[PDB]
Write a protein that binds this ligand. Sequence first.
Ligand SMILES: [Mg+2]
Ligand SMILES: [Mg+2]
Ligand SMILES: [Mg+2]
Ligand SMILES: [Mg+2]
Ligand SMILES: [Mg+2]
Ligand SMILES: [Mg+2]
Ligand SMILES: [Mg+2]
Ligand SMILES: [Mg+2]
Ligand SMILES: [Mg+2]
Ligand SMILES: [Mg+2]
Ligand SMILES: [Mg+2]
Ligand SMILES: [Mg+2]
Ligand SMILES: [Mg+2]
Ligand SMILES: [Mg+2]
Ligand SMILES: [Mg+2]
Ligand SMILES: [Mg+2]
Ligand SMILES: [Mg+2]
Ligand SMILES: [Mg+2]
Ligand SMILES: [Mg+2]
Ligand SMILES: [Mg+2]
Ligand SMILES: [Mg+2]
Ligand SMILES: [Mg+2]
Ligand SMILES: [Mg+2]
Ligand SMILES: [Mg+2]
Ligand SMILES: [Mg+2]
Ligand SMILES: [Mg+2]
Ligand SMILES: [Mg+2]
Ligand SMILES: [Mg+2]
Ligand SMILES: [Mg+2]
Ligand SMILES: [Mg+2]
Ligand SMILES: [Mg+2]
Ligand SMILES: [Mg+2]
Ligand SMILES: [Mg+2]
Ligand SMILES: [Mg+2]
Ligand SMILES: [Mg+2]
Ligand SMILES: [Mg+2]
Ligand SMILES: [Mg+2]
Ligand SMILES: [Mg+2]
Ligand SMILES: [Mg+2]
Ligand SMILES: [Mg+2]
Ligand SMILES: [Mg+2]
Ligand SMILES: [Mg+2]
Ligand SMILES: [Mg+2]
Ligand SMILES: [Mg+2]
Ligand SMILES: [Mg+2]
Ligand SMILES: [Mg+2]
Ligand SMILES: [Mg+2]
Ligand SMILES: [Mg+2]
Ligand SMILES: [Mg+2]
Ligand SMILES: [Mg+2]
Ligand SMILES: [Mg+2]
Ligand SMILES: [Mg+2]
Ligand SMILES: [Mg+2]
Ligand SMILES: [Mg+2]
Ligand SMILES: [Mg+2]
Ligand SMILES: [Mg+2]
Ligand SMILES: [Mg+2]
Ligand SMILES: [Mg+2]
Ligand SMILES: [Mg+2]
Ligand SMILES: [Mg+2]
Ligand SMILES: [Mg+2]
Ligand SMILES: [Mg+2]
Ligand SMILES: [Mg+2]
Ligand SMILES: [Mg+2]
Ligand SMILES: [Mg+2]
Ligand SMILES: [Mg+2]
Ligand SMILES: [Mg+2]
Ligand SMILES: [Mg+2]
Ligand SMILES: [Mg+2]
Ligand SMILES: [Mg+2]
Ligand SMILES: [Mg+2]
Ligand SMILES: [Mg+2]
Ligand SMILES: [Mg+2]
Ligand SMILES: [Mg+2]
Ligand SMILES: [Mg+2]
Ligand SMILES: [Mg+2]
Ligand SMILES: [Mg+2]
Ligand SMILES: [Mg+2]
Ligand SMILES: [Mg+2]
Ligand SMILES: [Mg+2]
Ligand SMILES: [Mg+2]
Ligand SMILES: [Mg+2]
Ligand SMILES: [Mg+2]
Ligand SMILES: [Mg+2]
Ligand SMILES: [Mg+2]
Ligand SMILES: [Mg+2]
Ligand SMILES: [Mg+2]
Ligand SMILES: [Mg+2]
Ligand SMILES: [Mg+2]
Ligand SMILES: [Mg+2]
Ligand SMILES: [Mg+2]
Ligand SMILES: [Mg+2]
Ligand SMILES: [Mg+2]
Lengths: 147, 210
Amino acid sequence: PSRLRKTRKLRGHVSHGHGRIGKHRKHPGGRGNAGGLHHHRINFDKYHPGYFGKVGMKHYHLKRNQSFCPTVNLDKLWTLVSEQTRVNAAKNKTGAAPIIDVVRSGYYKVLGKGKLPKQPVIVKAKFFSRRAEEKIKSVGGACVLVA
Amino acid sequence: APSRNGMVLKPHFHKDWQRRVATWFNQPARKIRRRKARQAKARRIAPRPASGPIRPIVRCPTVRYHTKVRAGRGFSLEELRVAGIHKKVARTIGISVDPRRRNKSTESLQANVQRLKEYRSKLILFPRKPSAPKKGDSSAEELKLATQLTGPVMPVRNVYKKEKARVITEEEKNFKAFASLRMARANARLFGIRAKRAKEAAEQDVEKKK
RNA sequence: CUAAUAGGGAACGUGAGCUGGGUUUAGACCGUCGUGAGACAGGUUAGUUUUACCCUACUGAUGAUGUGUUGUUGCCAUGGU
RNA sequence: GAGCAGAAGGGCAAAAGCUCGCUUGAUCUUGAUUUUCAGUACGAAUACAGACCGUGAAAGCGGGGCCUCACGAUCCUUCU
RNA sequence: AAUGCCUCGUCAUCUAAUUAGUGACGCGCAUGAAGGAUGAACGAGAUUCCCACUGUCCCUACCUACUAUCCAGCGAAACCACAGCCAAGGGAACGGGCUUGGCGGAAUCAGCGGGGAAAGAAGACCCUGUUGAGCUUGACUCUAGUCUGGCACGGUGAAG
RNA sequence: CAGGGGAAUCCGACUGUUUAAUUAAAACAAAGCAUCGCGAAGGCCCGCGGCGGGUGUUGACGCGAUGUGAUUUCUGCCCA
RNA sequence: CCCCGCGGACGCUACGCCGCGACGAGUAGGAGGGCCGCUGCGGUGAGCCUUGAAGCCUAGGGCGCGGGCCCGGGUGGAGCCGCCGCAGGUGCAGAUCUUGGUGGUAGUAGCAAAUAUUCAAACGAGAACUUUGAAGGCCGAAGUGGAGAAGGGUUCCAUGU
RNA sequence: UGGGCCACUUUUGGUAAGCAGAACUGGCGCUGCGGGAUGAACCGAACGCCGGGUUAAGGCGCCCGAUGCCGACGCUCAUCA
RNA sequence: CGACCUGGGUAUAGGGGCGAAAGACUAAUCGAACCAUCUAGUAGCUGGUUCCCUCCGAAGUUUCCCUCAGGAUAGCUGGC
RNA sequence: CGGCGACGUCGGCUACCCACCCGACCCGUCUUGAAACACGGACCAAGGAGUCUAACACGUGCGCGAGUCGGGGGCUCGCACGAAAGCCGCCGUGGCGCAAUGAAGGUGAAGGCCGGCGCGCUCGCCGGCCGAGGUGGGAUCCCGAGGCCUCUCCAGUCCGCCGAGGGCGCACCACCGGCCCGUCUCGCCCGCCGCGCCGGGGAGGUGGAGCACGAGCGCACGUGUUAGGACCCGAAAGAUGG
RNA sequence: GGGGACCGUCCCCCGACCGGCGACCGGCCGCCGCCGGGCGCAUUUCCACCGCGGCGGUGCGCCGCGACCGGCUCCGGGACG
RNA sequence: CGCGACCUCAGAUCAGACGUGGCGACCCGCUGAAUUUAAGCAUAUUAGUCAGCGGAGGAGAAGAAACUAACCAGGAUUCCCUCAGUAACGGCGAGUGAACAGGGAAGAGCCCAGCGCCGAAUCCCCGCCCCGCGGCGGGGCGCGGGACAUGUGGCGUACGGAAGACCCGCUCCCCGGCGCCGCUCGUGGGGGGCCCAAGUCCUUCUGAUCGAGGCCCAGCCCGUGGACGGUGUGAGGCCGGUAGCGGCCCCCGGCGCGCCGGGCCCGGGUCUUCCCGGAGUCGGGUUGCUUGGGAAUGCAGCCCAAAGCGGGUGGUAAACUCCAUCUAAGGCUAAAUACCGGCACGAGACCGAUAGUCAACAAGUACCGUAAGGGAAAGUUGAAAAGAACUUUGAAGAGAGAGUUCAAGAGGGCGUGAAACCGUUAAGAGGUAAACGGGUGGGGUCCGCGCAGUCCGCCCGGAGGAUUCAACCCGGCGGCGGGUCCGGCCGUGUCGGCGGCCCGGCGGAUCUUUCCCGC
Ligand SMILES: [Mg+2]
Ligand SMILES: [Mg+2]
Ligand SMILES: [Mg+2]
Ligand SMILES: [Mg+2]
Ligand SMILES: [Mg+2]
Ligand SMILES: [Mg+2]
Ligand SMILES: [Mg+2]
Ligand SMILES: [Mg+2]
Ligand SMILES: [Mg+2]
Ligand SMILES: [Mg+2]
Ligand SMILES: [Mg+2]
Ligand SMILES: [Mg+2]
Ligand SMILES: [Mg+2]
Ligand SMILES: [Mg+2]
Ligand SMILES: [Mg+2]
Ligand SMILES: [Mg+2]
Ligand SMILES: [Mg+2]
Ligand SMILES: [Mg+2]
Ligand SMILES: [Mg+2]
Ligand SMILES: [Mg+2]
Ligand SMILES: [Mg+2]
Ligand SMILES: [Mg+2]
Ligand SMILES: [Mg+2]
Ligand SMILES: [Mg+2]
Ligand SMILES: [Mg+2]
Ligand SMILES: [Mg+2]
Ligand SMILES: [Mg+2]
Ligand SMILES: [Mg+2]
Ligand SMILES: [Mg+2]
Ligand SMILES: [Mg+2]
Ligand SMILES: [Mg+2]
Ligand SMILES: [Mg+2]
Ligand SMILES: [Mg+2]
Ligand SMILES: [Mg+2]
Ligand SMILES: [Mg+2]
Ligand SMILES: [Mg+2]
Ligand SMILES: [Mg+2]
Ligand SMILES: [Mg+2]
Ligand SMILES: [Mg+2]
Ligand SMILES: [Mg+2]
Ligand SMILES: [Mg+2]
Ligand SMILES: [Mg+2]
Ligand SMILES: [Mg+2]
Ligand SMILES: [Mg+2]
Ligand SMILES: [Mg+2]
Ligand SMILES: [Mg+2]
Ligand SMILES: [Mg+2]
Ligand SMILES: [Mg+2]
Ligand SMILES: [Mg+2]
Ligand SMILES: [Mg+2]
Ligand SMILES: [Mg+2]
Ligand SMILES: [Mg+2]
Ligand SMILES: [Mg+2]
Ligand SMILES: [Mg+2]
Ligand SMILES: [Mg+2]
Ligand SMILES: [Mg+2]
Ligand SMILES: [Mg+2]
Ligand SMILES: [Mg+2]
Ligand SMILES: [Mg+2]
Ligand SMILES: [Mg+2]
Ligand SMILES: [Mg+2]
Ligand SMILES: [Mg+2]
Ligand SMILES: [Mg+2]
Ligand SMILES: [Mg+2]
Ligand SMILES: [Mg+2]
Ligand SMILES: [Mg+2]
Ligand SMILES: [Mg+2]
Ligand SMILES: [Mg+2]
Ligand SMILES: [Mg+2]
Ligand SMILES: [Mg+2]
Ligand SMILES: [Mg+2]
Ligand SMILES: [Mg+2]
Ligand SMILES: [Mg+2]
Ligand SMILES: [Mg+2]
Ligand SMILES: [Mg+2]
Ligand SMILES: [Mg+2]
Ligand SMILES: [Mg+2]
Ligand SMILES: [Mg+2]
Ligand SMILES: [Mg+2]
Ligand SMILES: [Mg+2]
Ligand SMILES: [Mg+2]
Ligand SMILES: [Mg+2]
Ligand SMILES: [Mg+2]
Ligand SMILES: [Mg+2]
Ligand SMILES: [Mg+2]
Ligand SMILES: [Mg+2]
Ligand SMILES: [Mg+2]
Ligand SMILES: [Mg+2]
Ligand SMILES: [Mg+2]
Ligand SMILES: [Mg+2]
Ligand SMILES: [Mg+2]
Ligand SMILES: [Mg+2]
Ligand SMILES: [Mg+2]
């Protein structure tokens, strides 16, 4: 809505909010990111450190599918299966542990943030972290690798 | 000129973009035109499936999608060979065939020939001359049972094997998943240089012993 | 020569007053400087000087207000000198 | 009232000056801080901490010059 | 000297009087030899003097034609914040307006050139702009053309 | 109808030409003098290109490129 | 246990109403409110209107701090507005602004290059200018004469206005 | 916004300047009002629309509100006060 | 009477022509014609920038910049 | 409490004209400073200048919420409106968020208390619990001795208010610990189909746009910055083709 | 692959107990109110008119006067310490 | 020193055909800047863009891998979403910048050369006869010509192919036609033509009305039609239209059956024996351009110049090695996609005559320039011309009367008719240019139903009228309350789940045949 804007309130004020001394001119200072090393250097250094220069090795023809490895933490591991899977295993008299295949749910790596409830579980994944495997074995579970 | 905190923005509007602007006001009309052409085509091929030929089961290429299965371009020639279908008769009875696709494994190959057998069993073949049925199909199976199938023929679904909960064995609890991954990476990294060093040590051993 | 040939101001009074000799465009010559284009509070020659009918000022010319109209003869405020 | 390399100012006497003896702390490192300052950088400087050393009988002192000056981004190159 | 700053050089001559002219001199700021120096004729070229001639002047006057002027008819434009009498003050340091004073009397005609810092043109002088263009070169970076080497078209014989 | 004249100085030899719309000149041109290149597979020049084109229907008493500027008289020294 | 009385103002769009205290300059600039204004769309006003819409004019009556608005009179002759939302090519004194129109100047400058006109008559409503006649003059054969080229294109010639 | 400027006082260059350059506070710029006749900055005082009272700075012959007080004490005569 | 004046026909076209040379002339345009387009070229520079009331209310200073008629930056401002 | 009232008077005036006293220079603009002898403006009418797109940032409103979003496609008499609306869910592909850090190879965020043991060696095998530590502040909330009442009292019946002190402490702030990735220094252990120039672990510093019980996504609106003709008008120029 | 069982939600029912009849509704009662029709037909009730009537509210068509009270303010007398 | 055959050339107004030029919005091939940004500027950017040249079509181009990948692999091209403002390029500055995978729209595949076999099996032309004319074919004939072994046709093309055997299946294609089709298919297929509901009812307004009231019946009449336009206002019913899987007439076209006629010719599996490929091209060097392509992505010039278990690619130059993947240097191909030109339509929160196209109109017109080119202004009487007969003054323009009209205070640039500016009339004023702010005063024009001044509640008194008041009865309707008085219920639990995988659903990353159809 153009009726809610400052231009309706600036009718009758000669400078339109841009001043009488400095006026509103075309491009004082340059166009775009002009002069980022000369007369806008303070702004670029203050808010964008690291902007200028090269760092690291360049790699031609990056295929992002090769490095596709979504990760899931331990605190969300039991959300990949139904609540019925969880409650049946908890009240199970035998030592049967459900299998959570994180690859089926769309994750490849199991990271170890958080804590697990105290009941065994078999976790299928492409990759595990050291602490994720340690906590899974702590609750009596097992880590099994898939490809 | 930059002003306080902000993002360094690089718009790509330095190249007379206003002369090449694609508006989409004909989008609702294009959807109507496509829909009418779809309906007209389905009427043209009267009892044949409206979507088109049956497509094979195909696994998606990369490591991002190899857990997923979709529909391919056409059945390979090895699949048709063991399904007993001529590669020139297949297209006339609604089987798409891709002569440039090979079969690296027998699991996907056998899954597609089961697909062809099931389609061939579901197929109602009208006689070429309706007065004289030669080898096509009984008149009862096509009197009213022949309808135009809608959607993809036998749509491809991602099946998931359900794993029953089992007692964890003692050997499973002793498997070191992180150590196995670290050692597998190191073994593949150092396989070549270990083979060179072993060969070089063999060179030094034989020359010393001689 | 004369009594004397005092010094000055007025947008260094005064260019819709003039003139245009000078300076101060474009042509050209000389000296000096510069590789050169070119330059010279150096010299020299040739080089378009537009408009007033408006307002005021001023100069003159009719008139105007008040004595009822109109005319003759007059006075002198004031200004100049 | 001399000298301390140099401009000037400060400082300094069994010193910081002069002469000897031994040396390489003018080395390897991570942060913090001060100075200019926007509390950005560079340069310079201060106080530590961890090595490895020097010197001295030792306490200690020393990571350059008694202090205040003596200097230099991105990109590229070159060496380790 | 169309070339000399000092300089209106110094001497002579021309005049009553000459920063002018001519002749002469020459350590010549900074003359000078494909241009130097002469020399008739020529020149809408620059300069000085003399005779004659005259309103250029003393020193203005008079006359003639066309205007201007007045009239009938016809009929613009420039320009215009508002306007239009001054002295002083203060003020963007030179007012038509403001302050203080002087004062102020309709509507006009012919003139006039003091003012309106009159009009005409977004100063051409001067500076600034990370605005140009014409030209030059011992600026930077290129380039047509040219010189040169190599390969190919490109072959057959001999002497070195 | 229809020249004022004379004595000189500077410049340009003269006649010619020139900035249409501020400069008619002492400027340009000029004859004369001098220098340079070239014998044609060439000199100088045009051309995006063609063994293209101009000089050239030419040939050194010619063509091309410069400087100075009639006559007279001279045109000195210097190749760092 | 109110009852011879059967009764008792207003209020409180709560985005409303009421009370008390202090305060009020403003360029550049920012913010809020606008029952200020223009145009169009969705709703709504059982809206207005040929018994007279819009627009315009008005020494008419008023309201509001203001932007503005309402009403009377006249002209006009066919459409228009209020409220809740929505959307803008949405508000002018300037820009040596654009286009159009109009003033003062001003009945002014001006209608002054090449010697020159005058008398009578006719036609005609009307004659300095037309036509005829009579004079006086000019071009003066390198013409103000007689013919062509280029260019123009019917200007040629009659008749009429 | 990143042109500042002015005044008391301190203060540098300059003969000085309504000059140029600093420090401090205030002001003008952005600000009207009373007074200084007049005036960006001085003196008083800062501002919604008004009535009454009283003041500031400044005044009270007349312009021009207010001494038209029987004001007090002296000083001063200028033919540029 | 000549390097004379002139008609018509031809040739040369824009970084080109043509010039007895003045940067002259090339259709009132010439130190690079005219026409259309790129193009609404760019401008730290000049001019303008349209209704009302209420509330708050500055800066001409710091640092850096081929920076000095401009910006970034801190400061001062307003709003939530 | 008085007077006065229809063809003459009564009241009114913002509005029309005129007179007088005081005050009053012409607006816009740049500017330290304009009435300026600074520029634009003769007059009137109509037109006339911060826009739209994209991308960010923050604020605000709305829906859903560890998710969110169909925008591309498809299905629905193909169509007045309707080019709308509705729906899809094995159309969520995908985007953004949910994980960071390193140039990369890669790695990748749970501790606290009570116990027996090797040696409770700065510590390794477990047990049991609990589930992001602690300090100082901290809105709110909870307890609360003691008071506050009636016509009065010996003696409790029900709850309301004030209340010194005490307690649990939201968000947030300061600080101290802890965890993850990079990089140093020191050091000793552990693993085994590959006994390795293999893999893992510890302590103490330090670098990170991190963790430490999520807050995002989509839509709308506003403001600011930017690229675009970019608030409007304005060069001297440059290029292409005639 | 089908068919089952189980779990989680649901959608209807067969019944009771619990809180309510509610802002989900009807029937009976009880109270109250209104309306219509009878009866009540006159010291009641209502309607309209008159008094230059009174008590209230508001307000005088215009122009004016006075009084006392209160707020603020400028003055003047008188008296006491 | 002649005649023939061939080869290579030439001429012809030879017989029959074809091309040229236009448009050019979209498409293909080239060529190709600078303004601009970088706060200067040269690389870069603008931009492979404007301008320039050529070539097409209803689409074009592309296109069936010398591909992507590195996976558990996908599988022509084109388009959309996403990848992604990413990898990368870049005075690593300003800036630039794809692809793969994934999801969709669409979906379609093929043909030669070569190697071989088959008596050149092949093709064009000219005559003759017949069936038909429609994009000129068929059939037959010609000791009729020519092309062609310097290679036509059939088979066949990397997905392998061919020939023989052996076995199995006889399976059935295309085209032109007669009669009729069902007739086509979101409801005939398309084009053209002609038609199809209901008020001009009563009373009124007006110049004219389509306006305003009314039309008892459940409501004037029709409505599958209440879109729109015209008509003297503003109309569902006055007219054209609108609605309708409405009607009638004519023409054209694409799907079958019975039949006609013509061509029309073997397919698969196994075994054996054979056969297999595009060269001044790839590739390398160098140069210039181009790209995100970075020790060189693509393109081109010049030089070098291949191979055959080879060659290309495998995003860092090189050697060795393994592996993967394709098969270049020949060709065709629909769909999805594009479309500011054209033909014909529909619509709009757009503009409303200085706006919107330059152009609402005799507009690319008038006019300007030698030319390339530049380029306007300009809409409105009235319902109907009923467009002012006639008289009169004047030479006429122009007037005064008269007349038409609802209106000429609508009179042919004529709807309305502002401001600036001007004339006249009326009022007021005038020597400090006008104009303005504050305060009064005077005059004037209007306004006030001004001119004896409000009103209304209760009470008192006076004189009058009356469906006449309270209380009771009958009926109707409400409001409030009632242990639930009675139902109907509502929330929360609460049990047999009798009741729902038959006799109720939807789900579940929960278990199973241990009854059932696929190893
Ligand atoms: Mg303001
Ligand atoms: Mg303005
Ligand atoms: Mg710099
Ligand atoms: Mg003077
Ligand atoms: Mg003059
Ligand atoms: Mg003068
Ligand atoms: Mg002169
Ligand atoms: Mg000159
Ligand atoms: Mg020289
Ligand atoms: Mg002259
Ligand atoms: Mg006198
Ligand atoms: Mg140390
Ligand atoms: Mg030291
Ligand atoms: Mg001289
Ligand atoms: Mg003399
Ligand atoms: Mg002499
Ligand atoms: Mg010589
Ligand atoms: Mg004066
Ligand atoms: Mg200027
Ligand atoms: Mg200029
Ligand atoms: Mg600058
Ligand atoms: Mg230049
Ligand atoms: Mg050089
Ligand atoms: Mg001469
Ligand atoms: Mg001579
Ligand atoms: Mg001449
Ligand atoms: Mg001239
Ligand atoms: Mg001349
Ligand atoms: Mg000579
Ligand atoms: Mg010569
Ligand atoms: Mg105040
Ligand atoms: Mg204020
Ligand atoms: Mg606008
Ligand atoms: Mg205007
Ligand atoms: Mg005159
Ligand atoms: Mg005259
Ligand atoms: Mg004569
Ligand atoms: Mg003649
Ligand atoms: Mg004639
Ligand atoms: Mg400035
Ligand atoms: Mg100063
Ligand atoms: Mg200012
Ligand atoms: Mg202030
Ligand atoms: Mg003030
Ligand atoms: Mg004052
Ligand atoms: Mg004074
Ligand atoms: Mg007062
Ligand atoms: Mg006074
Ligand atoms: Mg007085
Ligand atoms: Mg004195
Ligand atoms: Mg010159
Ligand atoms: Mg421009
Ligand atoms: Mg300025
Ligand atoms: Mg200005
Ligand atoms: Mg100034
Ligand atoms: Mg001003
Ligand atoms: Mg002035
Ligand atoms: Mg001026
Ligand atoms: Mg100016
Ligand atoms: Mg002007
Ligand atoms: Mg103007
Ligand atoms: Mg307007
Ligand atoms: Mg939709
Ligand atoms: Mg996904
Ligand atoms: Mg805490
Ligand atoms: Mg901490
Ligand atoms: Mg911002
Ligand atoms: Mg612009
Ligand atoms: Mg340039
Ligand atoms: Mg022929
Ligand atoms: Mg630039
Ligand atoms: Mg610039
Ligand atoms: Mg430039
Ligand atoms: Mg083009
Ligand atoms: Mg063509
Ligand atoms: Mg094609
Ligand atoms: Mg193709
Ligand atoms: Mg192929
Ligand atoms: Mg992204
Ligand atoms: Mg590019
Ligand atoms: Mg599809
Ligand atoms: Mg063949
Ligand atoms: Mg109609
Ligand atoms: Mg109608
Ligand atoms: Mg009909
Ligand atoms: Mg119809
Ligand atoms: Mg590599
Ligand atoms: Mg128009
Ligand atoms: Mg109009
Ligand atoms: Mg006439
Ligand atoms: Mg009328
Ligand atoms: Mg009219
Ligand atoms: Mg008038």
